């Protein structure tokens, strides 16, 4: 059903009788009560036009966020592709279990102190099983088939679009089981989407340190089976392990229950 706006409130009056009772409910059945405000108090007729577009999953998720930072103090680094490295986004996408979406990436590159220097960089996306470069002049940099991006540092940040590349129907943030017939537990093969590598094009030694920031935007998202959020700080990038001593309470405590 379509609900462009929240339901209006109808007029009501006092009620006195036997048998009918909307106030009493049955929470043991596990169903939220369907009692409306018009069934307990006298309410005037109020028409509301509060739209619900801002609460759609697409608008809620359509916000770029930092996913990882890369520093280049040999001239190249091969960074594995993962999106669970920062809480600010991990908590957001971990509320659901399975989501199918479309990712858009943006790369911001600058020196450690933020100064900009003319320098040419190259980015390659290595699918799983593809050869992995091991040197600034490795033969794997010929990018015969793998996609490549070339951009100068002074140029505006690059923007690319990545389709949904999982073998399964949708990504899964949890895998209760083993992929093979203890650290292995919880590793879903359907999430390893290859790695990422950056380098300086010149065969010489670059004289400036390189820092890259990657922001991921989402679109055409579709969620399934929402799960409760997380109220404990993360400890690892793969499993929900937590500090077993300082169990943080969900709600801040007070002095007395009567006040």
């Amino acid at each position: 059903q379509v609900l462009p706006t929240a339901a209006n409130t109808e007029a009501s009056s006092h009620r006195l009788g036997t048998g009918v009772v909307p106030a009493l409910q049955a929470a043991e059945t596990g169903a939220s009560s369907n009692a409306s405000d018009k069934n307990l108090i006298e309410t005037r007729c109020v028409l509301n036009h509060h739209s619900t577009q801002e609460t759609a999953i697409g608008n809620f998720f359509s916000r770029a966020g930092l996913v990882s930072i890369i520093t280049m103090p040999d001239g190249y680094v091969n960074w594995d592709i993962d999106l669970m490295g920062y809480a600010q986004l991990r908590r957001k996408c971990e509320l659901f279990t399975y989501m199918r979406f479309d990712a858009e990436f943006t790369f911001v590159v600058a020196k450690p102190n933020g100064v900009l220097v003319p320098q040419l960089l190259q980015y390659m996306y290595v699918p799983p099983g593809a050869p992995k470069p091991t040197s600034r002049d490795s033969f794997a940099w010929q990018t015969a088939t793998n996609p490549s991006v070339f951009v100068k540092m002074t140029d505006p940040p690059a923007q690319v679009s990545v389709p949904f590349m999982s073998p399964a129907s949708a990504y899964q943030w949890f895998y209760d089981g083993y992929p093979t017939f203890d650290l292995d537990y919880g590793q879903c093969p359907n999430n390893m989407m290859g790695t990422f590598s950056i380098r300086t094009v010149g065969t010489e030694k670059s004289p400036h340190s390189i820092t890259l920031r990657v922001y991921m935007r989402i679109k055409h998202v579709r969620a399934w089976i929402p799960r409760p959020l997380r109220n404990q700080p993360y400890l690892f990038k793969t499993n929900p392990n937590y500090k077993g001593n300082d169990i943080k309470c969900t709600s801040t405590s007070r002095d007395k229950i009567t006040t």
Binding site: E28, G30, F174, D176, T180, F181, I225, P228, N231, Y242
Partner: protein
């Protein structure tokens, strides 16, 4: 509405005082459709044989218990024709109907939260407890860093000794792939945590049992391995 009876297969469960039936996410279990199937081998549907209600062990509720949980379908992996069949195949798809029974006298008090959490992942062997089922250690965070106070967002039914003694949940097969193994993955887990501790005056039936009964609904299988 207080009474109900379920007669799936060669078994039957009756209750003279029970709440309503809770269907998970409003999707009745059903066989895999042709438009969604990816397997090319003809599957097998044992039907009546695998839908017999299976009763697991009995857990003893105490005045200071923490909670218990089970992993599915690892509980049924080692019992009955379902066990002897899943050990001979490679592809598995079925729903589940979960029934939990725990009855006390009219003078006892206490509450239970029977909730099925799909795709339960633990944190810091015990991952697959089996038919016995393991106990919890930190029920407030469910050993997974999530608050129990928000566990009601999942399909659940309350068992309050004041009103009812049993609860039922009918959960369909939920997984990102139409078929999936039975020895390397767990579709979902079940949580039973006493929110309100059991209290009673001295001189009552101290032994109070807890029993869980489950039964597959629309079982199907594919592939013929040797023995796993």
């Amino acid at each position: 509405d207080r009474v109900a009876q379920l007669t799936i297969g060669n078994s039957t469960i009756t209750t003279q005082e029970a709440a309503n039936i809770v269907i998970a996410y409003g999707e009745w279990p059903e066989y895999c459709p042709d438009t969604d199937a990816t397997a090319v081998d003809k599957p097998t549907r044992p039907d009546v044989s695998v839908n017999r209600f299976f009763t697991l062990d009995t857990k003893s509720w105490a005045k200071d218990s923490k909670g218990w949980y089970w992993k599915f379908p690892d509980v049924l992996t080692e019992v009955g024709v379902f066990g002897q069949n899943a050990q001979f195949h490679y592809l598995y798809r079925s729903g589940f109907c979960v029934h939990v029974q725990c009855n006390a006298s009219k003078f006892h008090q206490g509450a239970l939260l029977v909730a099925v959490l799909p795709e339960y992942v633990l944190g810091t062997a015990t991952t697959q407890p089996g038919q016995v089922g393991a106990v919890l250690t930190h029920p407030y965070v469910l050993d997974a860093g999530i608050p129990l106070s928000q566990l009601t967002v999942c399909p659940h039914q309350w068992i309050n000794l004041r009103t009812n003694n049993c609860a039922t949940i009918i959960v369909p097969y939920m997984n990102t792939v139409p078929f999936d193994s039975a020895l390397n993955h767990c579709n979902f887990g079940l949580l039973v945590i006493p929110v309100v501790p059991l209290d009673f005056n001295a001189g009552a039936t101290s032994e109070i049992p807890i029993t869980v009964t489950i039964a597959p609904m629309c079982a199907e299988f594919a592939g013929l391995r040797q023995a796993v």
